[PDB]
Design a protein around this ligand. Structure first.
Ligand SMILES: CCCCCCCC/C=C/CCCCCCCC(=O)O[C@@H](COC(=O)CCCCCCCCCCCCCCC)COP(=O)([O-])OCC[N+](C)(C)C
Ligand SMILES: CCCCCCCC/C=C/CCCCCCCC(=O)O[C@@H](COC(=O)CCCCCCCCCCCCCCC)COP(=O)([O-])OCC[N+](C)(C)C
Ligand SMILES: CCCCCCCC/C=C/CCCCCCCC(=O)O[C@@H](COC(=O)CCCCCCCCCCCCCCC)COP(=O)([O-])OCC[N+](C)(C)C
Ligand SMILES: CCCCCCCC/C=C/CCCCCCCC(=O)O[C@@H](COC(=O)CCCCCCCCCCCCCCC)COP(=O)([O-])OCC[N+](C)(C)C
Ligand SMILES: CCCCCCCC/C=C/CCCCCCCC(=O)O[C@@H](COC(=O)CCCCCCCCCCCCCCC)COP(=O)([O-])OCC[N+](C)(C)C
Ligand SMILES: CCCCCCCC/C=C\CCCCCCCC(=O)O[C@@H](COC(=O)CCCCCCCCCCCCCCC)COP(=O)([O-])OCC[N+](C)(C)C
Ligand SMILES: CCCCCCCC/C=C\CCCCCCCC(=O)O[C@@H](COC(=O)CCCCCCCCCCCCCCC)COP(=O)([O-])OCC[N+](C)(C)C
Ligand SMILES: CCCCCCCC/C=C\CCCCCCCC(=O)O[C@@H](COC(=O)CCCCCCCCCCCCCCC)COP(=O)([O-])OCC[N+](C)(C)C
Ligand SMILES: CCCCCCCC/C=C\CCCCCCCC(=O)O[C@@H](COC(=O)CCCCCCCCCCCCCCC)COP(=O)([O-])OCC[N+](C)(C)C
Ligand SMILES: CCCCCCCC/C=C\CCCCCCCC(=O)O[C@@H](COC(=O)CCCCCCCCCCCCCCC)COP(=O)([O-])OCC[N+](C)(C)C
Ligand SMILES: CCCCCCCC/C=C\CCCCCCCC(=O)O[C@@H](COC(=O)CCCCCCCCCCCCCCC)COP(=O)([O-])OCC[N+](C)(C)C
Ligand SMILES: C[C@@H]1CC[C@@]2(OC1)O[C@H]1C[C@H]3[C@@H]4CC=C5C[C@@H](OCCC(CO)CO)CC[C@]5(C)[C@H]4CC[C@]3(C)[C@H]1[C@@H]2C
Ligand SMILES: Oc1ccc2c3c1O[C@H]1c4oc5ccccc5c4C[C@@]4(O)[C@@H](C2)N(CC2CC2)CC[C@]314
Lengths: 1097, 123, 168
């Protein structure tokens, strides 16, 4: 079977053929007209029964008694005399002729289908989404008129209610009733425009025009949609999307649908509107020009439990306008206090021809409907209440259903409508039980509903008291919003093992992720012993700065719109942007370094650059507002961010525009110069004063008035010397001059013959490297406070520190061999322990020349070239691998052809690489190419096949010398162009690193540094740019920062609103409105001139 | 050549990636010295005893329904992008301001018919 | 997932078949490099036999890759497979090797020197040239890397389109 529609559903047929409601008919043909015009109660003439038994009722006699007593005439029903059977009509309508020939699923099923089977059909089979609202549109079932204004004024609003909520609209489907005008709303306003409306039409099958076409197993039945526009015929409206055509086994009688529609309303209102939201899907009724029975249908709702609100429209002067009339007459309680019944009874009969009797009984219904005037709503178009029927239909669920303030709020959340919640829920009158707004906040955060989170904070929600450890863990562990797949894998990486299957994320584990992502020596609060001794136990279970914690949450969960919102709220705004940049940057790197090929890394990199640019633009706001306070923002210790600074965080992210900003550079210049105040020509004034100490007194020094602000800060003769030598610019040149003297000596040592005992030059060289090594050990341990393992990893992340480490270790291996070698020989090169040591020195000196590139990179021009070279060498690997394969592809055949008598030796390795490598540089070995030529320098190599090798070398050089070298050059040219474009930015970032480096160094260079060591560690036993603010100036700085955040958004909005695109569009929208306003003059000007022609007489 | 290929470098490798993933998906589990066993063992199992999804006609129909929905969403977004563009907004504004200039002259014409008719009823 | 299905899962994974073919190919080249650089005797060394076995079975593999390719006419199957560069190169590499082996192996030694016999020398020299094909086929393995691959495509496009400059 494997077919749920066919297997489950049911079609009835009338098995039973009583005459047409009495004696068959007169007309002398008698038995003959019994074929022509004699039907059943079934609604079908004799040949339209067509049942297997009804055809045995076409041959001899019918299925009854001889004369068929009359309590069998009444005995026909659609319960006992109709046979259920699998269905026939279902598929997709093709409304051929209607505007792209719309499509709409359809099905023929009995009135007695169980309500759950219906729900299975709508949601499972048809793949419909469970809605967040159900609008049931009742109205007049007979072709009626509708004024042009109200037409386009209804179809703007009912559509928005079903489009802003995903509401199922419900109709009869057939165009004879209100469904025709629901279609008008759909045609105009381009009903969905990629934003589906589901409007089901539940109609009876026995009335459908062209019943036949739809018959067929899963058939695409087409359907004429252009019959006479006046002739009222039960023709399905071509703009609906779904049809449930209710069968009662009959033809030509309505009323089989009344239950199944209502049963569907019950069935949906007993479904959860959302996973967390514990309400039922709301239902509401809408009334467009109702007939008589529509009145009772209102009451039929107002009583039932739970009730159903009823929004009654106006216009057209029937049940719709009528209920609008009396709804203004009856009092607040619900009983007309005046004596004005015969006047409204008069009005009933002007709309419903009764005369007196049904008129009152029709009035008797309504006085009960006017009891429950809280579940009734009138949207009158004239004086324009509610501003919209959208909000009216929606607001009707909020008033009159005695719903808690919470239930009112959370339903707007499901719908994602703040405009209704702001205006209609948050208002004087609501009472708001103890923890309802907070539970609302949790739902809004979890569901990524930023607009409500905004609203809740404004309307009285404290994030300080809201945000707890349990609620924060519930936010990390949810799956009901935008998630980050990576986060689970980052937790699995920092938790070295695996996890039980239903592992719920812990904040300690988040803390370990944040430390991984921030790196260096960052330590999160969550990993600290205080928080642990709290957390293991679980005023203290709250957080002092919740908006810091939720920013981290939103970024780790890849919830960027929420992260941008939580950034602009709270304190520490520049830090939060810089932390966010680093977090996303590191996640981007993890994605890039994974084996997955996707767009996650470029997405996360973009998010990092978004917050990075916010931090730069905030720094420029602050700098233009107040330079001194801008510099304080760069330097204040961030207690909440591992005691770091915003400058250090920006450096951790390779955020060069922030570091290159003038404010940062001004800060760095003051550190570099110290108390020195030369504006020009400082390099040689410092050099000559290192070498001529009395020239120190001729230099310009800052006054204490100047050395007072310096927002990173921590004249007699003696203090001028102190000021000079403790200045980092001086420590640079003093270290530089000593380093150059070091190299000149060590160069002398390796070039000059080495004796038994080191020369005085060599001793000085040894002393330098030894004390330079002690310095490097101390730079690691007196580095940024952290774990020793973290300190180690950071310091070995620089190139020149790895090189210096190898340089230092190799030197003392070399010195040990050079110095501890016993001389069995007078020659001193017969001893090969000694020679090994000397050769290490000769290679070790390379490290020390290459370390001069780091000194030279202190210059603004040289520095970017040094970074170029590093990037060239670091990224050329794969081109060189290809070059090596090309080399061997030539080297191996050359050796094999030219030297065919070789036994295995390691000389084979040399010979296959050696000459081919030197060819890269243009050495062709001209007189070795053709070994059989007269001018050959290898005549003994002449032999069989040796004529091949010139052809091989011809190809090799073309590929190697021309193609491959110039590919490598092309790669290097791109590096040049990339770095040159950002050259000034590159040096300004380098400038941070060397100013910080020499700020922390001691005042003596590495030969004499030992005294600075030996004197300092006494003062600790015997007895960098970080501003330590008090809590009062800390609060002023936060106030400064929030002002500049406000000014940032203001300028952003002003720039946006001044842009030409924004001016074209507002003009566009505004000219459109005016074109109606002028037609509204062009319309009213008639009413003037024609009324003047009326008063002309 | 370098500049042309470098501009599309990630695209180039991702296309290459199709070719080698397909190549090694079809290869046997042993490399060419020992592949002979994979040969000698496989052709026995045929005598003695790539990325293609074989759908049933029912899921085939669901996929076509999925596809046509996404074709509709493609044209909708295309139309919305077009209609939001500044050029399309200048021109509709252009055409619409033109109409209004007649509609105002249609007020400026009819306002006469009012004031002059009022001067007629003034007597 | 039991023990036996983890081995099945591993070895049938295409990433594994890549590295397992790559490690065997590198070992192949290292041996064949040894064979051509070291003096060649009457009978193939054990290294040379392994080299022969690789190319023979690699050839059977290529024949089967063509016939168990995408379903079609044999003429269409052939045209498709000879549309790749490395398949044309491997075809020449395989045919030339067994021309070289036949001469190297079926040469009667009238001489003790072994380079006086010029059928033998012809075979050895073919090996020394044939090994170039097998180094250049490493570019295809290396193009599996994200950085190296585009450079390999660059080189091919350089060589393919430089003809008329070289004619000048
Ligand atoms: C034994 C001698 C041969 C090997 C050479 C050894 C020497 C050193 C050179 C090595 C060059 C190869 C480097 C790549 C392989 C390492 C891992 C790697 O990255 O694999 C990649 C594929 O790897 C391949 O496709 C390699 C194929 C083998 C090439 C063998 C010949 C190369 C040498 C030619 C002969 C001349 C030179 C040598 C002198 C004879 C996949 O990497 P991944 O991790 O999936 O991707 C990283 C990116 N991610 C983070 C986004 C995922
Ligand atoms: C922008 C740029 C700014 C400017 C930058 C400027 C940089 C300024 C840098 C400046 C200093 C440069 C000097 C270093 C090289 C000296 C070598 C030399 O000439 O040796 C000769 C001089 O005699 C001696 O050297 C004897 C003294 C031994 C100890 C060396 C100390 C030298 C002074 C350094 C104090 C420590 C400094 C370092 C501390 C770490 C000895 O050779 P000889 O006599 O010919 O040999 C005899 C041969 N015989 C055996 C055959 C007879
Ligand atoms: C974060 C920090 C970054 C920087 C790294 C910092 C750490 C840097 C660490 C550096 C040390 C690296 C290891 C060196 C090992 C020496 C090996 C050697 O040559 O052994 C030889 C000498 O061995 C001896 O013991 C005699 C030589 C005197 C000792 C000189 C080296 C130690 C000083 C180190 C000062 C380091 C200062 C560190 C200060 C902090 C043994 O062989 P032989 O005796 O020659 O054999 C003679 C045979 N024959 C007689 C037959 C001929
Ligand atoms: C990203 C990169 C990832 C890493 C990639 C790593 C790639 C891994 C690849 C790895 C394998 C590398 C080895 C191959 C080269 C060996 C040559 C050699 O050293 O020979 C020597 C060793 O002795 C022998 O070779 C004797 C054994 C003969 C058969 C060869 C099997 C060798 C192993 C291969 C197994 C098959 C493998 C291939 C299957 C197709 C013999 O020389 P000799 O003794 O000096 O000569 C005597 C001279 N005399 C006559 C003067 C006395
Ligand atoms: C789509 C697929 C893509 C790949 C292509 C796949 C197909 C690849 C096809 C490859 C075959 C190419 C042709 C080779 C012909 C050999 C020529 C030769 O050297 O002849 C010589 C040896 O001739 C002999 O018959 C003796 C040598 C033994 C046979 C070895 C080669 C055949 C194996 C092939 C295995 C191929 C495996 C293929 C498996 C599929 C004749 O001369 P001589 O005897 O040396 O003369 C001696 C004279 N003297 C005595 C005076 C000194
Ligand atoms: C005397 C004769 C005997 C000796 C002969 C020896 C032969 C020659 C041997 C060596 C040559 C010296 C260079 C070695 C490699 C450099 C590392 C590197 O790329 O760093 C770079 C990246 O990578 C890292 O920072 C981490 C990688 C290295 C691991 C840490 C070292 C571990 C021990 C050793 C193992 C590693 C390999 C070395 C082991 C041999 C750092 O770049 P950077 O500068 O940070 O750029 C930004 C600068 N900024 C922050 C200011 C903006
Ligand atoms: C990380 C630290 C690792 C290293 C720690 C230190 C380990 C200890 C290291 C060395 C100790 C060596 C002591 C002697 C050993 C026994 C042999 C012997 O005595 O004599 C032999 C020494 O032959 C040599 O080769 C000696 C030099 C070896 C060093 C090789 C480089 C390693 C250091 C590179 C830098 C690495 C650093 C990289 C930086 C990261 C021969 O000399 P002879 O006997 O006098 O002469 C006899 C011949 N004659 C008869 C012709 C005269
Ligand atoms: C005795 C002979 C004379 C001496 C030689 C002359 C002295 C040597 C000269 C220069 C040495 C290097 C200068 C360093 C400049 C600073 C760089 C830095 O800070 O970090 C850089 C690393 O930098 C490196 O990795 C440096 C190079 C490694 C050592 C190899 C040296 C060359 C030898 C091999 C060549 C031979 C091959 C052929 C062999 C046959 C970091 O840059 P990056 O990672 O690219 O940045 C990416 C940024 N991103 C995050 C946005 C992606
Ligand atoms: C041992 C010593 C003795 C031997 C020494 C002999 C000397 C050396 C001899 C030869 C060097 C080897 C290369 C030969 C030519 C390459 C063809 C080519 O350009 O292909 C390219 C285009 O073109 C084609 O694909 C069709 C052109 C070739 C025709 C088919 C081969 C017919 C037989 C042979 C006649 C042809 C000429 C060769 C006949 C000699 C294919 O490019 P691709 O890779 O598909 O690029 C896209 C890849 N992708 C789909 C994955 C994205
Ligand atoms: C597509 C397949 C086509 C080829 C199929 C195979 C065809 C068959 C091929 C070869 C058969 C050769 C048998 C011998 C012929 C008679 C001569 C003779 O016996 O001796 C002579 C051999 O002289 C030579 O040159 C022998 C080598 C010829 C091969 C040339 C390269 C072609 C293959 C390239 C690759 C192409 C593959 C391209 C890939 C697409 C001399 O030697 P001798 O007599 O011992 O010494 C006398 C001199 N003495 C007195 C000084 C000692
Ligand atoms: C013994 C010596 C050492 C060995 C040498 C080193 C090893 C050799 C190195 C590299 C070999 C080639 C690498 C192939 C990379 C893949 C390319 C591919 O897939 O197809 C490419 C073809 O590719 C070719 O045609 C390849 C080259 C043909 C053989 C000539 C080799 C060089 C010698 C001659 C030079 C000497 C001249 C001077 C002579 C005196 C297809 O690319 P395309 O068609 O351009 O694409 C256009 C796309 N379009 C459709 C948009 C238009
Ligand atoms: C992918 C690339 C393919 C090419 C290649 O790299 C990888 O493959 C490697 C194989 C290597 C050889 C293996 C074995 C030996 C034997 C040894 O013999 C002892 C010495 C003797 C002294 O007398 C004892 O007494 C000498 C060295 C030699 C011939 C190797 C040379 C280098 C070779 C050819 C390498 C070559 C560059
Ligand atoms: O570019 C800068 C522009 C203007 C200023 C600076 C800049 O950088 C600084 C820097 O750098 C120098 C290098 C050599 C000699 C003198 C200086 C100085 C001077 C200075 O100290 C200074 C003014 N104010 C303090 C003063 C109270 C305002 C702080 C910032 C400062």
């Amino acid at each position: 079977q494997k077919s749920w529609i066919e297997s489950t559903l049911t079609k009835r047929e009338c098995v039973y053929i009583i005459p047409s409601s009495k004696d068959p008919h007169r007309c002398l043909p008698g038995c003959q007209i019994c074929q022509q015009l004699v039907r059943c109660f079934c609604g079908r003439l004799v040949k339209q029964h067509a049942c297997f038994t009804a055809s045995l009722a076409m041959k001899y006699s019918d299925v009854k008694l001889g004369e068929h007593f009359n309590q069998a005439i009444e005995e026909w029903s659609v319960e006992k005399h109709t046979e259920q059977s699998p269905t026939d009509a279902y598929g997709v309508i093709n409304f051929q002729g209607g505007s792209h020939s719309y499509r709409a699923k359809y099905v023929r099923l009995s009135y007695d289908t169980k309500p759950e089977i219906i729900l299975q059909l709508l949601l499972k089979e048809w793949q419909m989404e469970l809605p967040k609202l159900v609008i049931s549109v009742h109205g007049g079932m007979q072709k009626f008129e509708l004024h042009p204004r109200i037409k386009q004024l209804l179809g703007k609003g009912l559509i928005k209610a079903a489009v802003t909520t995903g509401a199922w609209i419900l109709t009869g489907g057939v165009n004879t009733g209100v469904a025709k005008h629901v279609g008008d709303a759909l045609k105009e306003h381009a009903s969905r425009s990629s934003r589906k409306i589901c409007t089901i039409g539940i109609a009876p099958w026995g009335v459908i025009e062209n019943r036949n076409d739809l018959v067929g197993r899963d058939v695409v039945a087409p359907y004429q949609t252009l019959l006479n526009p006046l002739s009222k015929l039960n023709v399905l409206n071509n703009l609906h999307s779904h049809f449930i055509l209710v069968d009662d086994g009959t033809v030509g009688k309505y009323g089989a649908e009344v239950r199944l529609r209502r049963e569907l309303e019950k069935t949906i209102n007993q479904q959860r509107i959302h996973a967390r939201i514990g309400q039922g899907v709301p239902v509401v009724a809408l009334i467009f020009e109702g007939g008589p029975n529509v009145i009772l249908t209102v009451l039929e709702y107002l009583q039932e439990s739970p009730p159903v609100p009823v929004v009654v429209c106006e216009g057209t002067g029937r049940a719709a306008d009528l209920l609008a009339y009396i709804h203004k007459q009856t009092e607040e309680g619900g009983n007309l206090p005046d004596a004005a019944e015969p006047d409204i009874i008069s009005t009933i009969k002007k709309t419903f021809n009764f005369g007196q009797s049904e008129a009152v009984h029709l009035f008797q219904t309504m006085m009960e409907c006017m009891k429950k005037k809280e579940l009734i709503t009138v949207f009158h178009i004239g004086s324009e209440d509610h501003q919209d029927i959208d909000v009216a239909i929606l607001t009707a669920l909020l008033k009159g259903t005695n719903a808690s303030a919470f239930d009112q709020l959370i339903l707007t959340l499901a719908w994602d409508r703040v405009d209704i919640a702001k205006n209609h829920v948050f208002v004087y009158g609501q009472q708001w039980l103890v923890g309802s707004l907070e539970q609302a906040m949790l739902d809004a955060l979890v569901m990524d509903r930023v607009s409500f989170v905004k609203l809740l904070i404004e309307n009285g929600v404290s994030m300080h008291k809201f945000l707890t450890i349990p609620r924060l863990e519930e936010l990390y562990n949810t799956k009901q919003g935008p998630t980050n797949p990576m986060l689970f894998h980052l937790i699995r990486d920092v938790k070295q093992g695996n996890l039980p299957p239903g592992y719920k994320i812990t904040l300690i584990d988040i803390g370990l992720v944040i430390e991984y992502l921030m790196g260096g020596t960052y330590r999160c609060t969550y990993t600290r012993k205080r928080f642990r001794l709290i957390y293991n136990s679980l005023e203290t279970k709250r957080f002092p700065y919740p908006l810091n914690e939720l920013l981290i949450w939103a970024c780790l969960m890849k919830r960027q719109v929420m992260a941008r919102f939580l950034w602009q709220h709270g304190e520490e705004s520049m830090a939060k942007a810089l932390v966010a940049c680093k977090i996303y940057r590191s996640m981007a790197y993890e994605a890039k370094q994974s084996d997955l090929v996707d767009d996650t890394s470029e997405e996360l990199k973009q998010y990092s650059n978004d917050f990075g640019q916010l931090a730069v633009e905030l720094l420029e706001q602050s700098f233009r507002q107040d330079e001194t306070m801008a510099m304080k923002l760069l330097t204040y210790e961030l207690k909440n961010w591992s005691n770091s600074t915003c400058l250090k965080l920006a450096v951790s992210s390779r955020l060069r525009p922030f570091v290159a900003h003038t404010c940062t550079q001004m800060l760095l210049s003051d550190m570099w110069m110290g108390r020195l105040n030369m504006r020009k020509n400082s390099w040689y004034k410092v050099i000559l004063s290192i070498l001529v100490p009395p020239a120190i007194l001729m230099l310009e020094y800052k006054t204490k008035a100047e050395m007072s602000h310096i927002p990173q800060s921590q004249l007699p003769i003696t203090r001028k010397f102190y000021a000079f030598y403790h200045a980092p610019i001086v420590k640079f040149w003093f270290n530089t001059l000593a380093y150059l003297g070091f190299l000149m000596l060590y160069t002398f040592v390796v070039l000059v013959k080495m004796e038994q005992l080191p020369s005085v030059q060599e001793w000085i060289v040894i002393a330098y490297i030894f004390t330079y090594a002690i310095e490097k050990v101390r730079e690691v341990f007196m580095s940024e406070a952290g774990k020793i393992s973290q300190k180690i990893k950071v310091w070995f992340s620089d190139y020149f520190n790895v090189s210096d480490t190898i340089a230092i270790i190799s030197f003392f291996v070399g010195f040990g061999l050079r110095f501890g070698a016993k001389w069995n020989y007078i020659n001193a090169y017969d001893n090969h322990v000694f020679v090994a040591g000397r050769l290490i020195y000769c290679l070790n000196i390379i490290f020390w020349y290459v370390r001069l590139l780091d000194f030279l990179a202190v210059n603004q021009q040289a520095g970017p070239y040094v970074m170029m070279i590093g990037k060239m060498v670091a990224n050329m690997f794969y081109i060189v691998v290809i070059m090596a394969l090309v080399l061997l592809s030539f080297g191996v055949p050359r050796k094999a052809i030219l030297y065919p008598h070789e036994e295995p030796s390691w000389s084979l390795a040399k010979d296959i690489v050696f000459h081919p490598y030197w060819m890269i540089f243009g050495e062709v070995y001209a007189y070795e190419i053709d070994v059989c030529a007269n001018d050959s320098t290898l005549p003994t190599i002449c032999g069989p096949g040796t004529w091949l090798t010139p052809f091989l070398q011809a190809v090799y050089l073309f590929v190697q010398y021309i193609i491959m070298v110039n590919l490598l050059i092309a790669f290097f040219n791109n590096v040049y162009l990339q770095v040159k474009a950002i050259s000034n930015i590159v040096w300004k970032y380098q400038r941070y690193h060397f100013i910080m480096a020499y700020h922390e160094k001691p005042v003596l260079p590495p030969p004499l540094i030992i005294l600075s060591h030996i004197v300092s560690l006494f003062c600790c036993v015997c007895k960098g740019p970080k501003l330590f603010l008090t809590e009062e100036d800390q609060k002023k700085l936060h106030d400064f920062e929030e002002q500049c955040v406000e000014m940032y958004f203001d300028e952003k909005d002003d720039k946006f609103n001044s842009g030409s695109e924004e001016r074209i569009r507002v003009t566009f929208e505004r000219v459109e409105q005016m074109s109606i306003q002028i037609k509204e003059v062009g319309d009213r000007v008639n009413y003037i001139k024609r009324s003047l022609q009326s008063l002309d007489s």
